[PDB]
Amino acid sequence: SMVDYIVEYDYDAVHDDELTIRVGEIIRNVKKLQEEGWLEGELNGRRGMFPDNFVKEIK
């Protein structure tokens, strides 16, 4: 099924494939891709990468 994450800390994108995220946002349809320490997910209509220590998994 689908995995969602809560944003716990602000992060501004440093590369174009990264999300800019803000505390309180839910990132949806989260996937672990090949990259270590990062995740991929949907936010406000787009997809992108985000650091996995800025967010908490909704279980």
Binding site: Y9, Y11, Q34, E35, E36, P51, N53
Partner: peptide, 10 residues
């Protein structure tokens, strides 16, 4: 306590 983003694979 603020997190530091892990390095990208790059």
């Amino acid at each position: 306590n603020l997190p530091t983003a892990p390095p990208r694979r790059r």
